[PDB]
Ligand binder design. Structure first.
Ligand SMILES: OC[C@H]1O[C@H](O)[C@H](O)[C@@H](O)[C@@H]1O
Ligand SMILES: OC[C@H]1O[C@H](O)[C@H](O)[C@@H](O)[C@@H]1O
Ligand SMILES: OC[C@H]1O[C@H](O)[C@H](O)[C@@H](O)[C@@H]1O
Ligand SMILES: OC[C@H]1O[C@H](O)[C@H](O)[C@@H](O)[C@@H]1O
Lengths: 150, 150, 150, 150
């Protein structure tokens, strides 16, 4: 009964534990870690002109960390894409987010991070904004979904 | 540029200094002060299930303080109304918000607070939710407007 | 169920029979009739770049006909306002729409139509667009409300 | 412009003429034709409780026609997916939509129609409704996108 946003996804599997950051007014910074798949994933959002830190979604796997810094508000995501598949190590197992790639309205590209292994997904946005992320994390990013608004 | 909401108003006059709390997921508490007019006006928002304290828009005048606590999220505002006019010592030239009055979907009325003098304003909400307030404040609540989503 | 819009109002009384044109993409023309109150009310909407005629909410009373033609798409409404009150030769007793006035982003004012008797209502719009009207009609316009979108 | 919706995609290629049906209040019927790719694509939308026929984007090619009738408003689309790739049979090997598939909230699957050749696409919708389709059609369905609303 509170305020809601359009939500697309998830892409990824049933594994790991639900999270949902909720909705805000834009993206400032995305922080992720990666190796053979995506590990950690966390976001500094914009909330009405000031940063808001989302709950951290940390894998303790010793992965490479990266800070994607957007030129907010003039720069914003126009595409979120990536690959989903199992990672061999979880014995018998369930699809995770192997790769993420981001494009901005400025023509910047971030990534691809991880390994482009498995089934492709792609959210090209023609009109609208990413205003929040949701997903599932175990030892790593099992699934990812986006909230959108105008 | 960042996420936007439907915004109605303002009601009141061009005095004091502008402010805009922006948009959130809902309303938990409204804090105001009053006597002949509205003084202080501040809001505790809901942002994704937790409280978020908006910026204070305080008056130093010795007015009566009231704290409006809604049972969010099942309770919500379905009307905002009030009167605007000069208050003929500190706002001789421009109208301020003299009164405010809120109704909820559970049939609680809060107010009228202040004095019911001058030009009526009335926003019944048939569908949608008040997500944020903006206004103008000097020693008094010169102006107010509302951001809406759903 | 089906897609929805933010809707505000009603302004007016409970007589007459309810009607709801629904939501569209914008406004091309408003047709009304007036004398001491508003009679007829009907709209030619924009629907994805072509006109779409709303049901006619006509009155048989001997009133003056007005057509408000907007320069769509560049011209849109930014204020809907008016007055409500009972009307003397009313076989019943409850409030009707005595007057309506509209302003646009091009600084055109259409009206007041009717008489400015009774209780004032005013919807300034700072962000978003009139995408439909609802109301109540008998021999006169008993009430009026507005759907809004981005 | 006039009123807007969140728009995602397009998926497919830059061939054949632009079309955009715009936005409505939901979907009733989708009509398409298929064989090696999608040819024809047209939609009967809901508009405020009544059917509204979108513009026809017919293919002349001698393809198999199908009619997808959703039990509107209780049933609606929760996934749009498909495949894009060039089609040997046009000399222009600009990518067209080779197949589509539609799932609903009741567990119905319509498709796949056409052949599942080239790059997958997939829009699963967690919250929100498809209100509109946009695309590109020459000989065949070159590309497709969706408008979403709440
Ligand atoms: O997140 C990747 C995997 O990590 C952990 O091993 C979880 O137990 C498993 O459910 C999840 O799929
Ligand atoms: O807020 C009431 C009034 O008082 C302030 O002290 C300001 O100087 C004036 O601009 C404002 O209209
Ligand atoms: O519209 C004015 C009035 O007109 C009609 O006569 C109706 O019977 C009444 O219900 C309504 O209030
Ligand atoms: O519709 C599929 C193809 O057929 C048409 O004839 C167009 O000329 C071409 O641009 C398009 O890619």
């Amino acid at each position: 009964m509170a305020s809601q946003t359009i939500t697309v996804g998830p892409w990824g599997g049933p594994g790991g534990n639900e999270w949902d950051d909720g909705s805000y007014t834009g993206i400032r910074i995305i922080e992720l870690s990666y190796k053979e798949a995506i590990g950690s994933f966390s976001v500094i959002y914009d909330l009405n002109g000031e940063p808001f830190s989302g709950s951290k979604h940390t894998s303790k796997l010793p992965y490479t960390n990266v800070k994607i810094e957007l030129q907010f508000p003039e720069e914003f995501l126009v595409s979120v894409s990536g690959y989903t598949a199992p990672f061999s190590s979880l014995a018998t197992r369930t699809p995770v987010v192997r790769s993420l790639k981001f494009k901005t309205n400025k023509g910047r590209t971030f990534g691809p991070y991880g390994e482009e292994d498995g089934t492709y997904f792609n959210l090209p946005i023609e009109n609208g904004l990413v205003v929040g992320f949701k997903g599932r994390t175990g030892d790593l990013l099992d699934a990812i979904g986006v909230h959108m608004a105008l």
